[PDB]
Amino acid sequence: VVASKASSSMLKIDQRNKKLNNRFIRKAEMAAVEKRKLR
Amino acid sequence: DDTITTEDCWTVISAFFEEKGLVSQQLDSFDEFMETSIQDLV
Amino acid sequence: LAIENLHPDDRLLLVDPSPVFFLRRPQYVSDG
Amino acid sequence: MIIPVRCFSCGKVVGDKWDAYLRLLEEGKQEGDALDELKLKRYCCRRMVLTHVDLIEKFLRYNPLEK
Amino acid sequence: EPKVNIINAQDDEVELMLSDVNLSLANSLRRTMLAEVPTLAIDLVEIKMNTSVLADEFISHRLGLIPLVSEDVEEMKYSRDCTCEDYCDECSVVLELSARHEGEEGTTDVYSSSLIKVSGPGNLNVGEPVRRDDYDQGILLCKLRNHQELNIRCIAKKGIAKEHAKWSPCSAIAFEYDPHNKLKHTDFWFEVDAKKEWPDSKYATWEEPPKPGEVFDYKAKPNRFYMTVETTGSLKANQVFSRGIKTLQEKLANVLFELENSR
Amino acid sequence: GVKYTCGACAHNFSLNKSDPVRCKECGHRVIYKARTKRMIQFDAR
Amino acid sequence: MNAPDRFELFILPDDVPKLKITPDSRVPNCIIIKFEREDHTLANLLREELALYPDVTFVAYKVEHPLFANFVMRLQTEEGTRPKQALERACASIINKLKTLDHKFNEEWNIKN
Numbered sequence: 001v002v003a004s005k006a007s008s009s010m011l012k013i014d015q016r017n018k019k020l021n022n023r024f025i026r027k028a029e030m031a032a033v034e035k036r037k038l039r
Numbered sequence: 040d041d042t043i044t045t046e047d048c049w050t051v052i053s054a055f056f057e058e059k060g061l062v063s064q065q066l067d068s069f070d071e072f073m074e075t076s077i078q079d080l081v
Numbered sequence: 082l083a084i085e086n087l088h089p090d091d092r093l094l095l096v097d098p099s100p101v102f103f104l105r106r107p108q109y110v111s112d113g
Numbered sequence: 114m115i116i117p118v119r120c121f122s123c124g125k126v127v128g129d130k131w132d133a134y135l136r137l138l139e140e141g142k143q144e145g146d147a148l149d150e151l152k153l154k155r156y157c158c159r160r161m162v163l164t165h166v167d168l169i170e171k172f173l174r175y176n177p178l179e180k
Numbered sequence: 181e182p183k184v185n186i187i188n189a190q191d192d193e194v195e196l197m198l199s200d201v202n203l204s205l206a207n208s209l210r211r212t213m214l215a216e217v218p219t220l221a222i223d224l225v226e227i228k229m230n231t232s233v234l235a236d237e238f239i240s241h242r243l244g245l246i247p248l249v250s251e252d253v254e255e256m257k258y259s260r261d262c263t264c265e266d267y268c269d270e271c272s273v274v275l276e277l278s279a280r281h282e283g284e285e286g287t288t289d290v291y292s293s294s295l296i297k298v299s300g301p302g303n304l305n306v307g308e309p310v311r312r313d314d315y316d317q318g319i320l321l322c323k324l325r326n327h328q329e330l331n332i333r334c335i336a337k338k339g340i341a342k343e344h345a346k347w348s349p350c351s352a353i354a355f356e357y358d359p360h361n362k363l364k365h366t367d368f369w370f371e372v373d374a375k376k377e378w379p380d381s382k383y384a385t386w387e388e389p390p391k392p393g394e395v396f397d398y399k400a401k402p403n404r405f406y407m408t409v410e411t412t413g414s415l416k417a418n419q420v421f422s423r424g425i426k427t428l429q430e431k432l433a434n435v436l437f438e439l440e441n442s443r
Numbered sequence: 444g445v446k447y448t449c450g451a452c453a454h455n456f457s458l459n460k461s462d463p464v465r466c467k468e469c470g471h472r473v474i475y476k477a478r479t480k481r482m483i484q485f486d487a488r
Numbered sequence: 489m490n491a492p493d494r495f496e497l498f499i500l501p502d503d504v505p506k507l508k509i510t511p512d513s514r515v516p517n518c519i520i521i522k523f524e525r526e527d528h529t530l531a532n533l534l535r536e537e538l539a540l541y542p543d544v545t546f547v548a549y550k551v552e553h554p555l556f557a558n559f560v561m562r563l564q565t566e567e568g569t570r571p572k573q574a575l576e577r578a579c580a581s582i583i584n585k586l587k588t589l590d591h592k593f594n595e596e597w598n599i600k601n
């Protein structure tokens with residue numbers, strides 16, 4: 001393929017952002033559901 | 040086990056769209072046609 | 082190490098002079 | 114398609130900060146922190162860089178028509 | 181009687197305070213700096229070859245928006261006021277860009293630093309594209325892959341932002357007066373309490389908050405105006421301020437000349 | 444007299460209004476006219 | 489297709505005067521001035537300068553349509569003074585104010601640099 005440097009950088013950014021989203025959004029949702037449950 | 044969050048549901052939906060796509064019904068119907076229907080009609 | 086590895090009392094010393102579920106980090110390739 | 118030269122709302126030159134923005138995102142900075150580092154204070158200018166889609170990279174993958 | 185006080189000063193931005201002036205004068209100064217200070221910008225593009233993936237008018241529009249150095253643009257003439265044939269050295273600056281990708285792999289970026297000044301006014305500091313540093317590459321113009329070339333010749337002319345926004349020296353002019361709302365020029369929307377639902381101004385500490393037992397002063401007028409002028413690099417901030425003042429003076433003098441000539 | 448360009452291998456050639464419309468070297472059936480020589484000017488606005 | 493040329497906002501035609509003054513006979517000592525190729529920038533400045541003069545009893549302006557670059561001013565003065573003289577005094581006063589403002593700005597910039 002011989003990918004460009006900008007495209008490879010964007011791919012690395014996308015992988016990091018996907019991992020960070022999958023952690024943080026799931027943790028926030030768990031905190032919200034436990035708070036709604038304890039009420 | 041552990042509970043299932045909304046993010047897990049979106050992971051399952053992502054699996055669905057990774058396997059099927061958005062035009063799977065058209066392609067599957069045409070493939071069924073070409074594979075068997077012409078022979079059966081003949 | 083990171084903020085998590087910091088002691089909780091020292092974490093309490095970091096006072097602004099929590100993430101929310103509806104602020105996603107932007108992507109470029111998406112999925113599907 | 115390619116990063117606009119000026120901000121639509123106020124006209125600040127944002128066309129010289131795309132590669133630096135990608136570099137900062139590569140280093141692990143958050144998008145808001147990266148925009149802060151590039152001195153984009155008004156949210157009109159932050160919108161220009163935060164919501165840009167680089168379509169020229171897809172257009173360049175087709176073979177040239179003249180050689 | 182008018183006074184000027186400067187808070188922060190930089191090449192590309194100045195934050196000042198105007199006092200003992202009318203609101204109309206400050207607003208007219210803001211409008212003049214936004215729309216009527218002349219600069220230099222590319223206006224005609226001759227395209228000799230363009231085999232990139234971008235349309236010709238796309239690249240021409242991008243070229244128009246590149247800020248050029250306009251320090252000596254006051255000594256230049258307007259193209260329609262020049263008696264010369266076609267374009268000469270006293271009403272235009274000629275720049276040339278030639279880019280190509282060598283090799284069969286990779287991509288080449290075309291930056292505004294690749295624009296080369298070929299001709300212009302003798303000993304005037306006009307025409308060169310603005311650059312923050314010596315190692316800065318400038319504004320991204322295009323991208324080229326193998327066997328794609330760009331070869332253009334541009335003509336920079338003098339103009340004002342009234343004709344097209346590419347000639348504007350400023351980006352945004354912050355403008356503000358009366359942070360504590362003593363003149364009651366605005367009526368604050370609220371749900372419970374207006375005081376704690378509205379953020380404080382950044383100049384709220386520059387003025388004494390009104391006393392609780394004070395009564396409304398109906399004889400007061402706006403007196404102190406805070407403004408920040410941000411430039412695109414084509415001119416320095418002090419140059420923009422001085423040339424705005426000069427442009428307003430020239431407009432007023434033209435009105436006075438028309439009045440005296442009317443007799 | 445008139446220049447062309449192949450749609451596949453980007454090869455340049457000429458036609459005399461009597462040859463079949465084909466690429467000389469790779470035999471593609473799709474060819475494109477070359478850009479004119481007249482002056483092209485834009486107003487950068 | 490029907491868009492006017494952008495330079496028409498500020499370039500004055502050869503046959504169009506920059507300034508046309510007619511009297512307003514309804515009230516004494518009033519004139520109507522028509523400014524061509526001008527907008528709020530000059531109008532508001534002149535109006536709010538003239539409104540502070542003791543011998544000026546009425547001053548106003550209006551831009552009839554935003555698609556045409558012109559405005560019309562109405563000016564009424566006392567019996568002793570003529571409105572044109574008041575307009576000239578206002579122009580000279582604003583020029584002097586801008587001159588001292590520029591001087592003080594240059595002084596402060598030199599001090600702080």
Ligand SMILES: [Zn+2]
Nearest residue numbers: 120123157158
């Ligand atoms: Zn902006």
Ligand SMILES: [Zn+2]
Nearest residue numbers: 262264268271
């Ligand atoms: Zn000339």
Ligand SMILES: [Zn+2]
Nearest residue numbers: 449452466469
């Ligand atoms: Zn061929």
